Design a protein around this ligand. Structure first.
Ligand SMILES: *C[C@@H](COC(=O)CCCCCCCCCCCCCCC)OC(=O)CCCCCCCCCCCCCCC
Ligand SMILES: *[C@@H]1O[C@H](CO)[C@@H](O[C@@H]2O[C@H](CO)[C@@H](O[C@@H]3O[C@H](CO)[C@@H](O)[C@H](O)[C@@H]3O)[C@H](O)[C@H]2NC(C)=O)[C@H](O)[C@H]1NC(C)=O
Ligand SMILES: *[C@@H]1O[C@H](CO)[C@@H](O[C@@H]2O[C@H](CO)[C@@H](O[C@H]3O[C@H](CO)[C@@H](O)[C@H](O)[C@@H]3O)[C@H](O)[C@H]2NC(C)=O)[C@H](O)[C@H]1NC(C)=O
Ligand SMILES: *[C@@H]1O[C@H](CO)[C@@H](O[C@H]2O[C@H](CO)[C@@H](O[C@H]3O[C@H](CO)[C@@H](O)[C@H](O)[C@@H]3O)[C@H](O)[C@H]2NC(C)=O)[C@H](O)[C@H]1NC(C)=O
Ligand SMILES: *C(=O)CCCCCCCCCCCCCCC
Ligand SMILES: *[C@@H]1O[C@H](CO)[C@@H](O)[C@H](O)[C@H]1NC(C)=O
Ligand SMILES: *[C@@H]1O[C@H](CO)[C@@H](O)[C@H](O)[C@H]1NC(C)=O
Ligand SMILES: *[C@@H]1O[C@H](CO)[C@@H](O)[C@H](O)[C@H]1NC(C)=O
Ligand SMILES: *[C@H]1O[C@H](CO)[C@@H](O)[C@H](O)[C@H]1NC(C)=O
Lengths: 520, 6, 549
């Protein structure tokens, strides 16, 4: 019996009163509430989840929840809390006090009795190793710690050592050069996340940040590392990459990067890594004068299996200098063109390649890029401006390709003259296809075909009869001509193979489902 | 935007 | 086998004509023997046709043509013998021709024009397409003798192995000379004899890598060339400079063009030699389309060309992977008025640098049609440095929306937001606009106060209601076709006092009597104004002609 009351973004100045006593989840986030009285919630005996984030509460008396014995989730993040009065509370599983104005770590000795505490959000401008002692015995899943904008003076390197968490996320101050010495290598952490990192001074480039990262080598438990909001030079960025390369991390994620300067550090050492996956998202770079290949060479020669780069202005990518272990590459949402990986014979192990949202145009050239990719099984080149010139003749696709996504391009029916033999999944929605040629019957392995949102008015009689493997077909959003002596086959086929049709193809003008037309 | 090196 | 028209214009329908019909009707003026099984052509099969001037024998497989067969046509103009098998021509056929204008012999196995001064008595031709990209390898003075004036001269000399001197210096004037040539061996010597005779020169398929320029003894005779086009040509950084030295031999050159060429380099050009430094001359327009550069991602900042940028007024660099026009370079192009960077890789951060303070100071028109722009607001703010910019085409860029307010160059007059994927239009659009195109989008309504808008293109949208006419007083043109418009306010067209053209076709006009009385009546006297013809949703009967009781 889950009852929910959402009064978020209502411009409320007080906790809304007179709410159902059935309420189990109250969400009054994003308002102008400044106080929480016991009388505001004492009747909500079934309250299990309370969200009062993004409000303006400055002080909070924890005894105010004494009548809410079902409470297990409390989110007071993003308020103006400077003080919390300690009193025995319920056994919370989730307590979020992050993004507030606390000077000292808001840890009550009482929190030590919260045996079921999985998530703990905190805030501080000052951090003492001892203030964590009250919850040191607790096996917390994730701890989020936001350091105030004035954090820094009289800093204790061992400040985090007593935390006992599996996952830890440290949010450093914004708009301030990184000059912190707080050791982020914690004994129990497998998943580490660090955010706001800025060191734009080439001289003594990120020595402080690189120093704390260096200390991560001594932590064999570290398995995942995530860096957010980085503002640095090209040299430092590459040093960060190099340093992490030799740690024990398996999964490395970087997002929201601002780069400047000239890249001089090209000598990358790929040896001794444990990295399985590297992803980089949203990168903006200032203009520069060094050859772009300096960047591409570093990434193209990485000895990892999974690599993703999205939301950057990368206009090209080079072929690896030696047979590469790349298995899955996701280069969606960049500025790549038809010549990416051209003249390559080193991506022989690549199984998946995503090139969605780039600047692709000529299909023939894309197919050639594919010729030596002997293990390629899935290829996505959707949301580009791809067209095929039949005058180029047969395409050179690898025979291993099984799933091909070419939706949202400008392909015509000539596309059926340029398709991999063993193709199983072919997505062609949102193109300029005006007909389905006879060549389609050669696709013996075709299981899923999507030709929705094109310009098909009809199909040849019996066109689908030789597609014995077919299981799914999309034909909707096409201007189907339902005049009887022409729509007969399709209407009948669509009726007998009802389970296969995804969506509902409809008649142009009439609007009636093709499946329902009957001819004499 | 490579800068001529000389 | 023909289906002649009511004017004597015979069409060669069923393509299987073994030969030319037996004595065709002389009242024929035109024919059509395009792609038909032919091999023999004599005078006794088209004899009674002196009134025939339009002869088209495109791709037939003609092996031999009996002489004296073009006199039976007497005054023949459009003479076509394209892509056949006439491997041995003869001035005999170019003897009966009295009033000829178009002679095309491209695609035939012949490898010469014979040492018997071909093309003579046809002293009326203006267009002559001679050659084949297979075996034509010789051009002597014994060719192009019976012609001193012609508009277009196309010579497919792909495998040209030898060129007899002055074989082209005969013709005095050629408005457009098209030359096909793979190697550049005989390029300088063919140039010396045409430089003072041609106006628009075009070189095709030539490999200009290693092309070296040597001061040719052509004399101080001024060149007649004003436009020099290079199509499907291969060039390197060094040879490009050599080509420049050649261009400096055409002081009157005004327009330079490169279509589908390949630059095997990174733009490390030299702007000077040991003797003559490259002069900008009077070149005012540079057009580059689909320039293939293998290492485009390694291209230089072009600072080695700063001394050739001060005077050019129009530049087009289309579909060539342009991701940046360096700020310093943009500042040097002080006369540039028109810049087209369509179908490239431009994004906001780099457009900002390209359009830095003082960049393209004189620019009035900027075209960034198919690039990678995403934010209208940021795109607009970036252009504020171009104080005299008045025309912006950013169509085919995926902006999905626009904020309530935006900043645009003060004198904005034309804005193209076609195929932009926008759902609505706001105050972001600048008030100074004279021409606005928001066609091919997802617009439902249009209510913008544009006091001096003369043209509104909003076809291919989903407009239920007509665009607010009370806010478009000066509206002269209004394309509102293909929009899902059913009704329309009464007297609404009385607002547009200067309307001249209007598109209304392809809209579900509900022609019920208690509604369309106004519209259906407005389209009457206002007939010249209507473009195409609006129809009724329940009948293909036009709305312009239907009055109500
Ligand atoms: C690093 C970037 C830079 O590329 C650009 O800056 C974009 C090109 C726009 C400017 C073209 C230069 C204008 C020259 C004017 C000359 C006036 C006439 C002089 C007398 C004849 O590179 C890229 O973003 C990737 C490649 C983009 C295409 C680069 C091709 C530009 C080549 C210019 C050749 C000009 C040759 C003129 C003399 C024949
Ligand atoms: C091929 O790649 C394209 C991506 O370009 C995939 O299409 C996308 O598929 C998703 C999931 O089906 C679509 O999401 C849908 O969004 C609508 C509206 O937001 C929502 O109502 C649906 O419930 C669903 O979430 C998305 O619209 C679509 N994107 C585009 C541009 O069409 C496609 O699935 C890939 N094909 C294969 C075989 O994987
Ligand atoms: C390396 O990149 C791979 C992407 O190609 C990625 O594999 C993908 O993993 C997802 C799981 O997140 C699979 O999707 C699954 O989605 C739901 C899970 O609830 C279920 O329908 C199925 O279990 C389904 O498999 C994708 O299928 C899978 N893609 C492929 C082709 O393998 C790997 O996880 C990445 N490896 C690392 C270490 O990051
Ligand atoms: C309590 O009420 C909050 C405000 O109404 C909810 O919030 C969320 O709203 C949606 C849905 O979860 C999400 O919105 C963001 O989506 C993406 C990711 O950030 C962005 O497009 C953008 O930032 C949107 O704001 C977020 O999850 C969150 N957004 C907001 C407004 O803060 C909240 O989910 C709800 N809590 C519960 C459990 O009911
Ligand atoms: C000449 O190229 C001068 C620089 C032009 C601007 C830079 C365009 C390319 C930007 C590359 C960004 C790469 C992001 C990180 C990818 C891993
Ligand atoms: C924490 O986990 C350890 C190891 O499983 C266990 O010995 C200890 O009792 C746990 N402490 C509590 C009560 O969370
Ligand atoms: C703007 O263009 C006009 C053309 O009429 C020109 O006269 C004027 O000098 C230009 N403005 C400047 C100085 O940028
Ligand atoms: C706007 O740009 C499109 C191409 O994107 C073009 O077809 C159209 O003519 C332009 N509009 C105007 C009014 O020039
Ligand atoms: C030839 O005549 C044309 C006529 O348009 C003229 O433009 C051209 O200058 C003349 N060339 C010379 C100098 O013979």
């Amino acid at each position: 019996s889950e009852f929910l009351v959402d009064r978020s973004k209502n411009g409320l100045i007080h906790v809304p009163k007179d709410l159902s006593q059935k309420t189990t989840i109250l969400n009054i986030s994003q308002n102008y509430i400044s106080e929480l009285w016991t009388s505001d919630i004492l009747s909500l005996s079934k309250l299990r989840i309370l969200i009062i984030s993004h409000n303006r509460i400055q002080y909070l008396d924890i005894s105010v929840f004494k009548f809410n014995q079902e409470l297990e989730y409390l989110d007071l993040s993003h308020n103006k809390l400077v003080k919390i009065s300690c009193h025995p509370t319920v056994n919370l599983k989730h307590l979020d006090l992050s993004f507030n104005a606390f000077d000292a770590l808001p840890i009550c000795k009482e929190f030590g009795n919260m045996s079921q505490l999985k998530f703990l959000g905190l805030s501080t401008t000052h951090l003492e190793k001892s203030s964590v002692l009250p919850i040191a015995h607790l096996n917390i899943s994730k701890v989020l710690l936001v350091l105030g904008e004035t954090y820094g003076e009289k800093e204790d390197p061992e400040g985090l050592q007593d935390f006992n968490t599996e996952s830890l996320h440290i949010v450093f101050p914004t708009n301030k050069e990184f000059h912190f010495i707080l050791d982020v290598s914690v004994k129990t952490v497998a998943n580490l996340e660090l955010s706001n990192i800025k060191c734009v001074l080439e001289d003594n480039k990120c020595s402080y940040f690189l120093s704390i990262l260096a200390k991560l080598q001594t932590n064999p438990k570290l398995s995942n590392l995530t860096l957010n909001n980085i503002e640095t030079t090209w040299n430092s960025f590459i040093r960060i990459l190099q340093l992490v390369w030799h740690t024990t991390v398996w999964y490395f994620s970087i997002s929201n990067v601002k780069l400047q300067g000239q890249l001089d550090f090209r000598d990358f050492d790929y040896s001794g890594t444990s990295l399985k996956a590297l992803s980089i998202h949203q990168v903006v770079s200032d203009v520069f004068g060094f050859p772009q290949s300096y960047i591409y060479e570093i990434f193209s020669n990485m000895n990892i299996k999974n690599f993703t780069v999205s939301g950057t202005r990368m206009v090209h990518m080079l072929c690896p200098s030696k047979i590469s272990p790349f298995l899955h590459l996701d280069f969606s949402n960049n500025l790549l063109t038809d010549t990416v990986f051209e003249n390559c014979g080193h991506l022989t192990e690549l199984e998946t390649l995503i090139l969605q949202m780039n600047q692709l145009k000529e299909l023939s050239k894309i197919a050639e890029m594919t010729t030596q990719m002997k293990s390629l099984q899935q290829l996505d080149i959707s949301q580009n401006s791809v067209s095929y010139d039949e005058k180029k003749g047969d395409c050179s696709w690898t025979k291993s390709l099984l799933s091909l996504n070419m939706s949202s391009n400008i392909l015509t029916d000539t596309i059926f003259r340029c398709l991999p033999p063993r193709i199983k999944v072919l997505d062609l929605h949102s193109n300029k296809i005006k007909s389905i040629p006879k060549q389609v019957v050669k696709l013996e392995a075709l299981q899923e075909l999507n030709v929705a949102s094109n310009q098909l008015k009809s199909v040849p009689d019996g066109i689908f009869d030789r597609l014995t493997s077919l299981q799914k077909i999309w034909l909707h959003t096409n201007p189907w001509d339902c005049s009887c002596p022409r729509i007969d086959y399709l209407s009948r086929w669509l009726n007998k193979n009802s389970q296969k049709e995804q969506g509902s193809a409809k008649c142009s003008g009439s609007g009636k489902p093709v499946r329902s037309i009957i001819c004499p | 935007x490579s800068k001529k090196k000389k | 086998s023909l289906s002649c028209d009511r004017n004597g214009i015979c069409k060669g329908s069923s393509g299987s004509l073994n030969s030319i019909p037996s004595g065709l009707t002389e009242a024929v003026k035109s024919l059509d023997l395009s792609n038909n099984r032919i091999t023999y052509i004599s005078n006794s099969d088209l004899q009674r046709c002196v009134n025939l001037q339009a002869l088209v024998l495109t791709s037939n497989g003609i092996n031999t043509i009996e002489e004296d067969s073009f006199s039976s046509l007497g005054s023949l103009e459009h003479l076509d013998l394209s892509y056949n098998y006439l491997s041995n021509l003869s001035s005999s056929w170019f003897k009966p021709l009295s009033s000829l204008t178009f002679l095309n012999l491209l695609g035939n196995p012949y490898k010469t024009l014979g040492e018997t001064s071909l093309f003579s008595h046809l002293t009326k031709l203006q267009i002559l397409r001679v050659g084949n990209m297979d075996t034509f390898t010789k051009i002597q003075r014994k060719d192009f003798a019976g012609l001193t004036f012609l508009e277009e001269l196309e010579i497919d000399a792909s495998d040209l192995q030898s060129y007899e001197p002055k074989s082209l210096k005969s013709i005095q004037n050629v408005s457009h000379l098209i030359l096909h040539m793979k190697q550049h061996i005989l390029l300088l010597e063919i140039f010396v004899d045409v430089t003072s005779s041609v106006e628009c020169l075009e070189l095709r398929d030539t490999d200009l890598d290693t092309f070296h320029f040597s001061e040719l003894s052509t004399g101080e005779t001024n060149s007649l060339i004003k436009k020099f086009t290079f199509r499907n040509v291969k060039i390197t950084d060094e040879s490009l400079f050599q080509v420049m030295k050649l261009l400096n031999q055409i002081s009157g050159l005004l327009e330079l063009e490169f279509d589908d060429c390949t630059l095997n380099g990174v733009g490390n050009f030299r702007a000077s030699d040991n003797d003559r430094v490259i002069d900008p001359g009077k070149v005012e327009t540079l057009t580059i389309r689909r320039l293939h550069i293998p290492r485009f991602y390694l291209f230089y900042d072009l600072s080695t060309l700063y001394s050739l940028t001060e005077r050019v007024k129009r530049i087009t660099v289309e579909n060539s992977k342009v991701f940046l026009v360096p700020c310093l370079l943009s500042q040097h192009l002080k006369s540039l008025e028109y810049l087209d960077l369509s179908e490239n890789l431009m994004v906001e951060e780099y457009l900002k640098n390209s359009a830095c303070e003082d960049a393209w100071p004189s620019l009035q028109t900027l075209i960034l049609r198919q690039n990678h722009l995403a934010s209208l607001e940021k795109t607009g703010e970036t252009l504020l440095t171009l104080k005299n910019l008045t025309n912006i085409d950013i169509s085919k860029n995926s902006f999905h929306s626009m904020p309530e307010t935006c900043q645009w160059p003060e004198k904005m007059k034309y804005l193209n937001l076609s195929s932009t994927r926008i759902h609505s239009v706001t105050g972001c659009i600048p008030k100074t606009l004279e021409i606005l195109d928001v066609s091919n989008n997802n617009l439902n309504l249009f209510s913008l106060n544009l006091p001096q808008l003369k043209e509104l293109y909003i076809s291919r949208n989903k407009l239920m209601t007509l665009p607010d006419a009370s806010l478009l007083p000066m509206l002269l043109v209004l394309k509102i076709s293909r929009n899902q418009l059913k009704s329309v306010p009464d007297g609404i067209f009385d607002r547009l006092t200067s309307l001249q053209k209007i598109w209304l076709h392809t809209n579900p006009w509900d022609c019920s009597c208690p509604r369309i009385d106004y519209l259906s009546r407005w389209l009457n006297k206002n007939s010249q104004k209507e473009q195409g013809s609006a129809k009724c949703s329940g009948s293909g009967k036009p709305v312009r002609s239907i009055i109500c009781p």
